[PDB]
Amino acid sequence: GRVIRAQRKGAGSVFKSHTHHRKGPARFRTLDFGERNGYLKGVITEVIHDPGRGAPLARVTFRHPFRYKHQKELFVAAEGMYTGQFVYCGKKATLMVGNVLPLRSIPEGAVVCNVEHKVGDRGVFARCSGDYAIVISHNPDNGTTRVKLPSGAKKIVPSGCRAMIGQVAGGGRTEKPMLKAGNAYHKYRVKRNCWPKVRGVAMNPVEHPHGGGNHQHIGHASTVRRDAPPGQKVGLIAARRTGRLRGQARA
RNA sequence: CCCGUCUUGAAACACGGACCAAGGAGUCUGACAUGUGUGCGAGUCAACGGGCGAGUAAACCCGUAAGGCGUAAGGAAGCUGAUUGGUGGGAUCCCCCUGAGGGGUGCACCGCCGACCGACCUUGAUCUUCUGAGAAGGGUUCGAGUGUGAGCAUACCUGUCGGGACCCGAAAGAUGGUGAACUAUGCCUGAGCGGGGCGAAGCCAGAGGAAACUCUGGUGGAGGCCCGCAGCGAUACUGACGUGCAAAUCGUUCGUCUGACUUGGGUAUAGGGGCGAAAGACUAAUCGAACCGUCUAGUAGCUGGUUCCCUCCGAAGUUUCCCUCAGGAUAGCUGGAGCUCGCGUGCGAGUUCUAUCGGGUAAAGCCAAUGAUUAGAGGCCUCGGGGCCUCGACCUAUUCUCAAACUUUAAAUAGGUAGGACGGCGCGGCUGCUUUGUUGAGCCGCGCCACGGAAUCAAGAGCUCCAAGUGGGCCAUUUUUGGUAAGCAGAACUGGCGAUGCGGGAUGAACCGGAAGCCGGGUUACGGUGCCAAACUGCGCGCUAACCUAGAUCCCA
RNA sequence: UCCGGUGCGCUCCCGGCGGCCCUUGAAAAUCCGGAGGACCGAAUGCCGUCCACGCCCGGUCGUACUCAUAACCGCAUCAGGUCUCCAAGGUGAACAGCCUCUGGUCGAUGGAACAAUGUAGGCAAGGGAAGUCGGCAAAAUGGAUCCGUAACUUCGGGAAA
RNA sequence: CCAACUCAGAACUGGUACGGACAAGGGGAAUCCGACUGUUUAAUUAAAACAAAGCAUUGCGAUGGUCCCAACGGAUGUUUACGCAAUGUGAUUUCUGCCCAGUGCUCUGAUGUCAAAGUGAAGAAAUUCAACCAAGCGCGGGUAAACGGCGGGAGUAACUAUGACUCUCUUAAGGUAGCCAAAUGCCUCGUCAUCUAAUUAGUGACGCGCAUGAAUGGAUUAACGAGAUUCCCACUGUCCCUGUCUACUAUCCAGCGAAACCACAGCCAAGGGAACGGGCUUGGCAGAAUCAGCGGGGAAAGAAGACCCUGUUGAGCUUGACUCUAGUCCGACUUUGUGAAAUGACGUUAUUUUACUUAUUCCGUGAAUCGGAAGCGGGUUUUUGGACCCAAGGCUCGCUUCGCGGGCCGAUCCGGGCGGAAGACAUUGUCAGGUGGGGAGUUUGGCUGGGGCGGCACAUCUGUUAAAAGAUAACGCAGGUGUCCUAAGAUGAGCUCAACGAGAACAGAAAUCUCGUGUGGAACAGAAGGGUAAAAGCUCGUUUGAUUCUGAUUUCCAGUACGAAUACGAACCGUGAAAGCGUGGCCUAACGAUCCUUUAGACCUUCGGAAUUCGAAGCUAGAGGUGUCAGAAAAGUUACCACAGGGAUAACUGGCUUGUGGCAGCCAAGCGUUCAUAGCGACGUUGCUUUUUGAUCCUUCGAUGUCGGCUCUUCCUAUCAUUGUGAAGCAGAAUUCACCAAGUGUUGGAUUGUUCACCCACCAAUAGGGAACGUGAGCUGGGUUUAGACCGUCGUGAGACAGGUUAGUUUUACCCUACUGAUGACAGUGUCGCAAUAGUAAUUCAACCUAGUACGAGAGGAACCGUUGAUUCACACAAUUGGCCAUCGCGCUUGG
Ligand SMILES: [K+]
Ligand SMILES: [K+]
Ligand SMILES: [K+]
Ligand SMILES: [K+]
Ligand SMILES: [K+]
Ligand SMILES: [K+]
Ligand SMILES: [K+]
Ligand SMILES: [K+]
Ligand SMILES: [K+]
Ligand SMILES: [K+]
Ligand SMILES: [K+]
Ligand SMILES: [K+]
Ligand SMILES: [K+]
Ligand SMILES: [K+]
Ligand SMILES: [K+]
Ligand SMILES: [K+]
Ligand SMILES: [K+]
Ligand SMILES: [K+]
Ligand SMILES: [K+]
Ligand SMILES: [K+]
Ligand SMILES: [K+]
Ligand SMILES: [K+]
Ligand SMILES: [K+]
Ligand SMILES: [K+]
Ligand SMILES: [K+]
Ligand SMILES: [K+]
Ligand SMILES: [K+]
Ligand SMILES: [K+]
Ligand SMILES: [K+]
Ligand SMILES: [K+]
Ligand SMILES: [K+]
Ligand SMILES: [K+]
Ligand SMILES: [K+]
Ligand SMILES: [Mg+2]
Ligand SMILES: [Mg+2]
Ligand SMILES: [Mg+2]
Ligand SMILES: [Mg+2]
Ligand SMILES: [Mg+2]
Ligand SMILES: [Mg+2]
Ligand SMILES: [Mg+2]
Ligand SMILES: [Mg+2]
Ligand SMILES: [Mg+2]
Ligand SMILES: [Mg+2]
Ligand SMILES: [Mg+2]
Ligand SMILES: [Mg+2]
Ligand SMILES: [Mg+2]
Ligand SMILES: [Mg+2]
Ligand SMILES: [Mg+2]
Ligand SMILES: [Mg+2]
Ligand SMILES: [Mg+2]
Ligand SMILES: [Mg+2]
Ligand SMILES: [Mg+2]
Ligand SMILES: [Mg+2]
Ligand SMILES: [Mg+2]
Ligand SMILES: [Mg+2]
Ligand SMILES: [Mg+2]
Ligand SMILES: [Mg+2]
Ligand SMILES: [Mg+2]
Ligand SMILES: [Mg+2]
Ligand SMILES: [Mg+2]
Ligand SMILES: [Mg+2]
Ligand SMILES: [Mg+2]
Ligand SMILES: [Mg+2]
Ligand SMILES: [Mg+2]
Ligand SMILES: [Mg+2]
Ligand SMILES: [Mg+2]
Ligand SMILES: [Mg+2]
Ligand SMILES: [Mg+2]
Ligand SMILES: [Mg+2]
Ligand SMILES: [Mg+2]
Ligand SMILES: [Mg+2]
Ligand SMILES: [Mg+2]
Ligand SMILES: [Mg+2]
Ligand SMILES: [Mg+2]
Ligand SMILES: [Mg+2]
Ligand SMILES: [Mg+2]
Ligand SMILES: [Mg+2]
Ligand SMILES: [Mg+2]
Ligand SMILES: [Mg+2]
Ligand SMILES: [Mg+2]
Ligand SMILES: [Mg+2]
Ligand SMILES: [Mg+2]
Ligand SMILES: [Mg+2]
Ligand SMILES: [Mg+2]
Ligand SMILES: [Mg+2]
Ligand SMILES: [Mg+2]
Ligand SMILES: [Mg+2]
Ligand SMILES: [Mg+2]
Ligand SMILES: [Mg+2]
Ligand SMILES: [Mg+2]
Ligand SMILES: [Mg+2]
Ligand SMILES: [Mg+2]
Ligand SMILES: [Mg+2]
Ligand SMILES: [Mg+2]
Ligand SMILES: [Mg+2]
Ligand SMILES: [Mg+2]
Ligand SMILES: [Mg+2]
Ligand SMILES: [Mg+2]
Ligand SMILES: [Mg+2]
Ligand SMILES: [Mg+2]
Ligand SMILES: [Mg+2]
Ligand SMILES: [Mg+2]
Ligand SMILES: [Mg+2]
Ligand SMILES: [Mg+2]
Ligand SMILES: [Mg+2]
Ligand SMILES: [Mg+2]
Ligand SMILES: [Mg+2]
Ligand SMILES: [Mg+2]
Ligand SMILES: [Mg+2]
Ligand SMILES: [Mg+2]
Ligand SMILES: [Mg+2]
Ligand SMILES: [Mg+2]
Ligand SMILES: [Mg+2]
Ligand SMILES: [Mg+2]
Ligand SMILES: [Mg+2]
Ligand SMILES: [Mg+2]
Ligand SMILES: [Mg+2]
Ligand SMILES: [Mg+2]
Ligand SMILES: [Mg+2]
Ligand SMILES: [Mg+2]
Ligand SMILES: [Mg+2]
Ligand SMILES: [Mg+2]
Ligand SMILES: [Mg+2]
Ligand SMILES: [Mg+2]
Ligand SMILES: [Mg+2]
């Protein structure tokens, strides 16, 4: 046999991300004294499109805390943000869509996005268009907070983690059908070299476990175990179940 | 009939070979072995080295407790370690005698039987340091032993084996390198793409309506939309070409043509890796694993080739074992080397004779067992069958026909043994075996006898060493299995071909004759004598008349 | 070496508007402008000056020619392959085809005959696929204007029916 | 006053010509497949294959999923579930049934099995034992849009037929909705309808469907297609049936000028022969040199057959093959320190939970207000798309003074942690166990009337083949063997069996008992053969010779081993009064080396510095096994394929044979109203043929191009028609049988790739065959038979299918010969002739007349002669008609 397609991606080469026209990483300010204790005011200058990213981005200008200069930032735009709007980041920032607050200051039931996992990591959760996290409860004793992630999982994060109030703008993107291979071509042209996909059963045995045979068929269970080595781990990896998700399974 | 070649079989419609020159294939080396030559000999070897020396890679000299091989073997080992020959044949010589003679001598070699050393077993008087010594006495056991050494060095042929290993030849495997100037895909930066057709949303005007909204005309120019130029691509003619213009082109005809579009340059991915809208595609005319060098003269039970002359001898396709069936080893067949003897008194023979022994095929047998099988006849006692009758069972004597796996009997052919000096007789002796018993058994000594104890032949007999080739067979008379049969397949005895020409069968590997140095003469074999074509249209009798191509010679058509 | 006209004309450049995207379509050198006003002259001679004019200076390497039916690659002076710029008149919807001007060129070894077979291009009485595996090949249709246009349909088409 | 070019209409006019050249859709009715656009095997496959939007499933919350990496690290990721990664299906519309037993995947963790380390015990110790003991496996649950699967028999309703219904075996579930002789149906050219004059085709139906079926997606579907298929209209040189025109070749010349190929060569018939000769045998024959063509032959060239087989050659691929491996999971030790508590074991000490931060790991930043304590406030910036830096001010020293330079406040103090998280876990290193076709290496017997499948003829016994010693083959024939037995072994004694006859309550064909006859007709473990009667059989008694130690011999055979057997010797025993017998089974089969392991035996030998005791190593004899049985450790596939070879061996022709196929004869039971033989020929029996198929394997594997059709010639006769005749159950007409006879002819079509077949139609007739199953350098390429692709069945899979389907490069002649024509030669030259010999050709039908005649009850119904035409064929020819034009002859006409 030869190295299968799934194995060739890890080496990089022609499978690296297409990032030539990207505007840069979108993240909160670096945690500093101003945000830990009070609040810092910023102004939205423009809402821009980032190739490969559905969610729009917002350029925000801040006054540097101790240097005579402007401080430029790039935030994942929340639904409702507009140019010329004042954005407040810090512990004492008011609860309004667009402001960035620590989870400690956000009451239960609030909708937040770009939630930090580690205090100061500048945002890792709920960053895609139309996605958000829901604050469940606070634990003053442990100093931790419970939030519901877009996938429906509940996670414990320290109360110092920051989050932007509101949901990510651009929601409803995936509802529209593409209708065309060309539209998919343009979508993935600015993401990475992952499209089109050739089915394993259409290949020869040399390059895929599903290949070969006088009929197109897998010939063995497509569910493969977790510990299968690379090149053997194709199909439904460590599937707890298969088939149509009916009843409580699709909850 | 063309050579070479594999082959049961080649002039072959089996392969190599257009022609000439030159080159072109059993070698070198290590080990061992038999044989032969040479030296010395219970020894032998100058081999590492030293002393020297043709001013010198030679030659010459040196082995003082060197070393190798030999001089002693047996045992796993601890250990022990050759008491030193008897006999039947036999070369040569000596004496007598002049016989296929009789005595003495008895080497080499062979047969037979003891003894000695050791492993194993067995045995133990008398001693001893308690485990040893050994008076005597052993064994269907075992040994590459002993019983007055034969080795060592060296030369060369041949043979086995390792190596490039007679020469040339794989598909592969490994190692280390080089390519993305083609092509595949991503990325960066540029460039390129007539004229037409359809007429989406939005917009204007008019008309209808209670409203909702509806209708008509225009405007507008949407789209992996249509026709189509360039570009890109490549469907058909299965057209041309097919030693081409071209290792993919040419002609006409075709697909697509604002997009998943086309294209330049830059840049990234490298060989079990890349890349792949996926054809195992593509990765520089190379891809179901590229290219280059090396390992490498890779290995081949397989194909091809393998170089002068005469002379002599001269095969095998069979046995056993083998992951053995295209191979190998083994035995047989063969050559070379001899050696031991012998000269007709031969002790030999693919032959017979005499005497004697075994056999179960051919035939025969069923009126003999076992099995198969036809018909009547008598008795009809007793059993069943049916209607006293009656058929069949039964019993007796007969009768037709049979057998590779039936048989009383039983050939032909073939098989075994014997026909003297290794015989016989007489008198003695030995024994632990044997017997009631010097009774037997075998052996030993002495003496005597033994015209060779059927025929024929005997270009003689015996013994050993080393080694080649071969281990595909085929044909025929006869016996014979499978098969309808076969120029089919498989066995038995012999011959033949293969390896072999020559005369005859027109022609033919096998049929008939017959086997061969180079010639002259003579005569034949098989076959022939009208011509072809050497020899009669010879001398005799009969048969045949074919208007079907009358008929015309084993195998044989 | 002069005086005018004309345009859904062609090539290039620019302007402005609109359509399209789950596609929004580089960077840096360099240059310009701005906010701020530390510091600085003169009592009028100094200071400042991106103004005008005058004066001086200008490295290294490439530069011929072909760019292709003969200068590149394909073993060749090979009907193949190889990026791009300029683009006249007529016919016509048209950088279609056909003809012409500028420029280029007659470079493909020549001569004589006019058999078969061939290759390429044609035509054909009457019949009209009977040919053949099969309408292969060829023929027929073709532009434009007007009229007219079915089944079916995802209502968009089908349709140049 | 100046304007450009679009549209509409009218008159006139030409031989109805006018998009006049150029340019430039054929159209329609349907089936199959794929939605579409797109992409694909550069140089044989453009497609139904790939992709696609849509749909569905799976993993993953960063201490992560997937992947790369020798290591360090890295890709996804400038990312964060509307995301990334891994799969299947394949627009829309309608749907997507049942099965979790099997194979996977997965969840769970009082519970068997389960490694190293560690722990305990015993021992002089090496070591041994026990306990404890991770993951995994096992056990239990889930999961089919995971791999996949989804059934038989019999009865049964007012004619039959059918089976709602009932009975019964049974599965994890028994194929549901649909669909179908389908690109899926063997039978099959299925049945019915439709299309045609005729249809193996097409379409629509029917369905117990060899072997349909639901995201291995089922059923549909507008639009689209250089995709497969059928029909209709138009159109035509595709054809009937060829003809002709132009150009360039060929041809001839000047100049220039190769190559393939070549044993020698080149006329035939038959024969024999390696079974298909240019050479040989016997014949026919045979006359210099040369030109243009031609494809019969040279089993022509091109290439050490790619098919098939063999080899102790490979390679790609697969997996339930053997042996391994990266990775990954898991445990121990290490990194690795500081505490506490609970519990447990013996001041130490295990286990569990938890605390500490400095090791270690991670996150953030241009390391920019961290920790503590004070002041202050109570119980520092948020209507606005501006601006924000380098300190004002106060206090206080120096001062080379009203100007410079410092200090402290403004701007709290203190703290030797840049900020945060996890934390002795994780991580790293080492070993241990599990998993591991992701990956590596390798294997995948032999015999064989080719190989495979089957079988075992591979070790092995009896009878026979086997030809009266021995030996003797086949995938010959009929059978047997891998065991069984403390007796079924040994020995002694007594007894006699099978069967039959005649007798005895129940009792009979057959229970038990009595007498008689009884050569074995019984029994003796098993196959068969042989052998045995006071026994080798049967019943009893005593017993272990089924024992120990060698050697020898036989069978096999190389005169090796093994197995088996036999005769002795030396011991110890059994049995019998004793002789004697007994070393397994009455005899002929019933079995196994080296190495290794294990056991038994010998107050045995060695552990090499000397000893002792363990342990180990030897000597002798057995046991654990190799059945491919003289004894490797071993699964597939290749249609992507490779190499060495093989005509030692298959797939053609030819050759032998002729069972089978085809054709023919003899006898005469019977049929034929009567009547064996006009015409037939049962039961038997004798042949021929090589146009059937088999059998064989002789020729060819350094290659003889492998179906059919087309085209073209020749040959055969076993005669379909035509000429001449005989026979009849021959009145006529028609028909049948037979004779001479191969001169002439034997056709046009639908369906099928076909050969074959079948139908329609015509005809005098629509006979049968050969020539390497004639004929591919003659064509064609539909089929078969490479590589792409689809279905069904089969297989875990790679893949397989004398199953279906669709797309798939057909090369070379100029050599010799043959044949066709062309010059020349043939003794000066020319004209006119003769002539051997060879070739050869004509053919069939119809009408009229005979004649409504002969004949016949009637129906019906001929023929010769003669006349006039026609068919097939042949050889010529162009007056006429028709065809061809570059007469480039004349005219017309488009664009320039
Ligand atoms: K690989
Ligand atoms: K891609
Ligand atoms: K796909
Ligand atoms: K498969
Ligand atoms: K040969
Ligand atoms: K041969
Ligand atoms: K030859
Ligand atoms: K010396
Ligand atoms: K010993
Ligand atoms: K050698
Ligand atoms: K490679
Ligand atoms: K071999
Ligand atoms: K007899
Ligand atoms: K008898
Ligand atoms: K041999
Ligand atoms: K220049
Ligand atoms: K060129
Ligand atoms: K037709
Ligand atoms: K397109
Ligand atoms: K699936
Ligand atoms: K299941
Ligand atoms: K299951
Ligand atoms: K197509
Ligand atoms: K010339
Ligand atoms: K391969
Ligand atoms: K740790
Ligand atoms: K594996
Ligand atoms: K007895
Ligand atoms: K064997
Ligand atoms: K026959
Ligand atoms: K062949
Ligand atoms: K030919
Ligand atoms: K095609
Ligand atoms: Mg997809
Ligand atoms: Mg494929
Ligand atoms: Mg695989
Ligand atoms: Mg042969
Ligand atoms: Mg020869
Ligand atoms: Mg021949
Ligand atoms: Mg050969
Ligand atoms: Mg040759
Ligand atoms: Mg020479
Ligand atoms: Mg010495
Ligand atoms: Mg001793
Ligand atoms: Mg060599
Ligand atoms: Mg290998
Ligand atoms: Mg490139
Ligand atoms: Mg388009
Ligand atoms: Mg188009
Ligand atoms: Mg269209
Ligand atoms: Mg062609
Ligand atoms: Mg084609
Ligand atoms: Mg030319
Ligand atoms: Mg790599
Ligand atoms: Mg591509
Ligand atoms: Mg393939
Ligand atoms: Mg190389
Ligand atoms: Mg063996
Ligand atoms: Mg050979
Ligand atoms: Mg016999
Ligand atoms: Mg007999
Ligand atoms: Mg007889
Ligand atoms: Mg041989
Ligand atoms: Mg021979
Ligand atoms: Mg003859
Ligand atoms: Mg005469
Ligand atoms: Mg140019
Ligand atoms: Mg115009
Ligand atoms: Mg033009
Ligand atoms: Mg015509
Ligand atoms: Mg006409
Ligand atoms: Mg017509
Ligand atoms: Mg056509
Ligand atoms: Mg239509
Ligand atoms: Mg398509
Ligand atoms: Mg392509
Ligand atoms: Mg191709
Ligand atoms: Mg093609
Ligand atoms: Mg769908
Ligand atoms: Mg690492
Ligand atoms: Mg579909
Ligand atoms: Mg389902
Ligand atoms: Mg279960
Ligand atoms: Mg343990
Ligand atoms: Mg466990
Ligand atoms: Mg059904
Ligand atoms: Mg069906
Ligand atoms: Mg039909
Ligand atoms: Mg038809
Ligand atoms: Mg369907
Ligand atoms: Mg449709
Ligand atoms: Mg297309
Ligand atoms: Mg001839
Ligand atoms: Mg010849
Ligand atoms: Mg020829
Ligand atoms: Mg020719
Ligand atoms: Mg070959
Ligand atoms: Mg070959
Ligand atoms: Mg081999
Ligand atoms: Mg072999
Ligand atoms: Mg291999
Ligand atoms: Mg493997
Ligand atoms: Mg075999
Ligand atoms: Mg066979
Ligand atoms: Mg005999
Ligand atoms: Mg015998
Ligand atoms: Mg007995
Ligand atoms: Mg015995
Ligand atoms: Mg006694
Ligand atoms: Mg026995
Ligand atoms: Mg044994
Ligand atoms: Mg020692
Ligand atoms: Mg054997
Ligand atoms: Mg043969
Ligand atoms: Mg030929
Ligand atoms: Mg005749
Ligand atoms: Mg009559
Ligand atoms: Mg005839
Ligand atoms: Mg047809
Ligand atoms: Mg024939
Ligand atoms: Mg033929
Ligand atoms: Mg031919
Ligand atoms: Mg051909
Ligand atoms: Mg043919
Ligand atoms: Mg074909």
**Which nucleotide is at minimal CA–C1' distance from A213?**
D799
| A38: DSSP letter | S
Q: Letter for the amino acid at A119? A: V
Render A1-23 in DSSP notation, one character per residue.
Answer: ----HHHHTTT-GGGS---TT--
Nearest to A196 by CA among A2, A4, A5, A3: A5
Contact between A171 and A132 (Cβ < 8 Å): no
Q: Letter for the amino acid at A3? A: V
User: Token pair of A172, please?
Assistant: 């409803």
A66 burial type by CB count under 10 A (0-12 exposed, 13-18 middle, 19+ buried): exposed
CA A60 to CA A77: how far, in whole Å?
10
CA A223 to CA A227: how far, in whole Å?
12
CA A109 to CA A171: how far, in whole Å?
20
Give just the sign of the alpha carbon dihedral A220, A221, A227, A229. Answer: positive
3-state secondary structure of A75: strand
3-state secondary structure of A74: strand
3-state secondary structure of A53: strand
3-state secondary structure of A188: helix
The number of angstroms, rounded, from the C-alpha of A28 to the middle of its chain's C-alpha atoms is 15
Provide the Cα torsion A229, A233, A237, A243; round to 10°: -150
CA A192 to CA A125: how far, in whole Å?
22
Number of neighbouring beta carbons within 10 Å of residue A55: 25
CA A196 to CA A237: how far, in whole Å?
21
In A 73-132, which Cβ lie closer than 7 Å to strand C?
none
Can you tell me which residue has the tokens 């990510």?
A168
Can you tell me which residue has the tokens 């060309």?
A182
Ligand 21 centroid–CA A216 distance in Å is 23
CA A24 to CA A12: how far, in whole Å?
20
Ligand 110 centroid–CA A138 distance in Å is 97
CA A236 to CA A116: how far, in whole Å?
31
Nucleotides of strand D lying closer than 7 angstroms to a protein CB:
36-38, 49-63, 65-68, 74-90, 100, 103-107, 142-148, 216-217, 316-319, 326-329, 363-366, 368-370, 380-382, 384-386, 388-389, 419-421, 434-440, 790-801
Contact between A39 and A29 (Cβ < 8 Å): no
CA A173 to CA A187: how far, in whole Å?
12
Strand A70-76 and strand A53-63: the pairing is antiparallel
CA end-to-end span of chain A = 41
User: Token pair of A70, please?
Assistant: 């402007």
Contact between A122 and A26 (Cβ < 8 Å): no
Method by which the model was determined: cryo-EM
- Stated in angstroms to one decimal place, the resolution of this structure is 2.3
CA A114 to CA A100: how far, in whole Å?
9
Distances from the Cα of A47 to the Cα of A28, A44, A100, A196, angstroms? 16, 8, 17, 32
Render A129-155 in DSSP notation, one character per residue.
Answer: TT--EEEEEEETTTTEEEEE-TTS-EE
User: Token pair of A29, please?
Assistant: 């300010």
A134 beta carbon to strand D: under 7 Å: no
Query: Which stretches within chain A are classed as H helix?
Result: 5-8, 33-37, 181-189
Nearest to A89 by CA among A139, A137, A78: A78
| A125: DSSP letter | B
Distances from the Cα of A128 to the Cα of A24, A95, A173, angstroms? 16, 22, 10
CA A4 to CA A208: how far, in whole Å?
6
Contact between A4 and A208 (Cβ < 8 Å): yes
Can you tell me which residue has the tokens 């059908």?
A177
| A31: DSSP letter | P
Query: Which stretches within A87-226 are classed as H helix?
Result: 181-189
User: Token pair of A162, please?
Assistant: 């920051």
